[PDB]
């Protein structure tokens, strides 16, 4: 139900392009889903402890500002994604 209309900033947009998403405006749900696919396809999660993402050597690490994080860190994830987009004035 995360329907917030958003326009990713250049870094986030580059990440989205990696999984085939080239539009400029998204729902938050879409951004979140595509970032999950990004992590999957770049194989940035630990194969033995899959909630751990190791992003130091990936562009994702520039977004999050840390070398690693857990998918359990929901507030941090949301926070870092929102700071990398602009919420659209006209919602809906």
């Amino acid at each position: 139900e995360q329907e917030t209309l958003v326009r990713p900033k250049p870094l986030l947009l580059k990440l989205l392009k990696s999984v085939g998403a080239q539009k400029d405006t998204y729902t938050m749900k879409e951004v979140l889903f595509y970032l999950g696919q990004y992590i999957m396809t770049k194989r940035l999660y630990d194969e033995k402890q899959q909630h751990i993402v190791y992003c130091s050597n990936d562009l994702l690490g520039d977004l999050f500002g840390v070398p690693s994080f857990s998918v359990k860190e929901h507030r941090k994830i949301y926070t870092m994604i929102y700071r990398n987009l602009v919420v659209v004035n006209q919602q809906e």
Partner: peptide, 10 residues
């Protein structure tokens, strides 16, 4: 096997 928020990616 990668779980993320509302979704599962293997």
């Amino acid at each position: 096997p990668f779980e993320w928020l509302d979704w599962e990616f293997x």
